[PDB]
Amino acid sequence: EVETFAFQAEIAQLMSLIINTFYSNKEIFLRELISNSSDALDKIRYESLTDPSKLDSGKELHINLIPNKQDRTLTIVDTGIGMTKADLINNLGTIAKSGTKAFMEALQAGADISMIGQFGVGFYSAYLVAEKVTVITKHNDDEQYAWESSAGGSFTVRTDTGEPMGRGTKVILHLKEDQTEYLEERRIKEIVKKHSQFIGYPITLFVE
Amino acid sequence: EVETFAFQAEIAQLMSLIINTFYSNKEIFLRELISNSSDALDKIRYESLTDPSKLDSGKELHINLIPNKQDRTLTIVDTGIGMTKADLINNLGTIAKSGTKAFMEALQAGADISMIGQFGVGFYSAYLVAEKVTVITKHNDDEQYAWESSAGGSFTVRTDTGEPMGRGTKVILHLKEDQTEYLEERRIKEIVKKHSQFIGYPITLFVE
Ligand SMILES: COC(=O)Cc1cc(O)cc(O)c1
Numbered sequence: 001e002v003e004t005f006a007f008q009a010e011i012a013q014l015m016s017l018i019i020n021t022f023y024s025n026k027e028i029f030l031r032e033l034i035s036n037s038s039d040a041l042d043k044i045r046y047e048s049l050t051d052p053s054k055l056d057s058g059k060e061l062h063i064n065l066i067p068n069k070q071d072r073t074l075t076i077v078d079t080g081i082g083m084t085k086a087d088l089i090n091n092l093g094t095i096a097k098s099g100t101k102a103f104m105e106a107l108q109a110g111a112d113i114s115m116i117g118q119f120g121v122g123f124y125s126a127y128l129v130a131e132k133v134t135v136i137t138k139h140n141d142d143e144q145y146a147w148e149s150s151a152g153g154s155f156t157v158r159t160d161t162g163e164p165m166g167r168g169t170k171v172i173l174h175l176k177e178d179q180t181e182y183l184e185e186r187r188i189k190e191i192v193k194k195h196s197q198f199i200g201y202p203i204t205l206f207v208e
Numbered sequence: 209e210v211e212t213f214a215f216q217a218e219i220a221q222l223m224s225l226i227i228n229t230f231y232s233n234k235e236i237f238l239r240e241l242i243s244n245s246s247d248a249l250d251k252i253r254y255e256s257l258t259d260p261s262k263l264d265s266g267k268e269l270h271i272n273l274i275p276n277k278q279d280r281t282l283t284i285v286d287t288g289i290g291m292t293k294a295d296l297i298n299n300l301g302t303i304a305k306s307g308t309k310a311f312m313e314a315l316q317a318g319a320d321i322s323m324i325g326q327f328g329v330g331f332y333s334a335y336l337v338a339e340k341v342t343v344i345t346k347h348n349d350d351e352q353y354a355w356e357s358s359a360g361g362s363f364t365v366r367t368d369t370g371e372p373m374g375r376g377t378k379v380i381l382h383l384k385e386d387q388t389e390y391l392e393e394r395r396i397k398e399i400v401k402k403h404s405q406f407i408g409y410p411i412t413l414f415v416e
């Protein structure tokens with residue numbers, strides 16, 4: 001059973017802007033996704049301070065980057081707090097309608113697409129490099145769900161029967177044919193060193 | 209009835225570092241506090257997306273800056289989500305023990321005190337300019353509380369019987385004798401324009 005939802009018009013507009021604007025500095029999507037993983041990891045750490053049972057679903061707090069040249073995918077996995085079905089549907093827990101508004105204005109008023117994360121919608125920067133994005137997530141309060149979208153105004157949500165993940169979020173980027181540089185080890189290491197060097201959780205880049 | 213608590217040793221160490229390190233670029237405390245107000249405002253906005261009653265305690269989402277030269281105070285008030293008593297005690301809702309660890313290392317490894325906010329402990333940057341900080345807060349789930357500390361290893365928490373605030377947080381900075389520039393209108397406007405120009409909520413600077 002797959003449920004199909006329409007994006008709110010402001011989110012569709014944000015996505016169309018990300019996809020259509022000429023903008024060379026696409027590598028910033030990786031910093032925005034690691035930053036989102038780091039924020040989700042902070043959340044579960046904080047809840048665990050007063051309730052250690054919150055980590056029964058996994059004690060390890062970390063971020064893995066997994067390139068796969070065969071499937072043309074780059075996957076980011078974190079063991080953060082995860083997202084409930086309701087959060088997934090409501091723009092992956094963001095206040096994306098009001099963030100889009102602030103970001104749109106900043107763009108006319110001198111900002112550029114790399115500052116997206118200052119408006120709380122950095123997740124959508126995945127569409128600088130991906131034709132399709134799949135998000136698998138498990139929150140302590142809910143079942144494991146898979147969200148997916150190739151943009152074009154809609155997204156789907158289903159229960160995920162794939163590998164159980166315990167707790168956290170996996171973002172699977174199905175890369176555009178011309179954006180395979182982001183599966184190269186040297187290129188990923190360069191971006192992580194450039195933009196993500198003070199993230200507080202181990203980032204492991206997997207080998208192929 | 210005033211309850212007095214000891215800071216965790218890592219937080220006392222972070223505060224001692226903030227207070228004792230020679231570091232001229234003190235103006236960054238204002239950006240860190242506005243950023244914290246903006247994050248608290250995002251939280252209440254998100255909860256209100258699925259439960260509008262969450263805003264019965266006040267619909268307006270904003271940040272006021274209130275200088276008072278007579279009391280030598282700069283107060284930042286937001287109508288964000290506020291903090292429960294438990295959050296106030298547990299380092300004002302931060303994961304400050306693990307943030308301090310990451311920040312300490314970044315400092316030996318080339319970072320400087322202005323990057324504090326990248327470690328989730330920007331609140332403590334108030335001690336670049338304040339001898340004493342009072343935080344009054346009201347969360348929908350709790351009573352209004354006042355937290356206070358002049359550093360030196362302890363902080364107090366009491367029920368606040370002062371002006372009811374509805375919902376949100378007020379940070380009252382009792383400025384060091386030599387840091388009164390931060391009560392001057394021209395100086396505040398300059399810092400807000402420099403560091404806080406893409407905050408998504410109206411910031412009103414009050415006149416004396
Ligand atoms: C801000 O949260 C989001 O946009 C969802 C999100 C969660 C996560 O753990 C990783 C991500 O890349 C995105």
Ligand SMILES: COC(=O)Cc1cc(O)cc(O)c1
Pocket residue numbers: 240241242244245248286288290299300301302331376377379
């Ligand atoms: C991250 O949250 C805190 O450190 C508490 C905090 C909340 C707030 O609304 C304003 C602040 O300046 C600080």
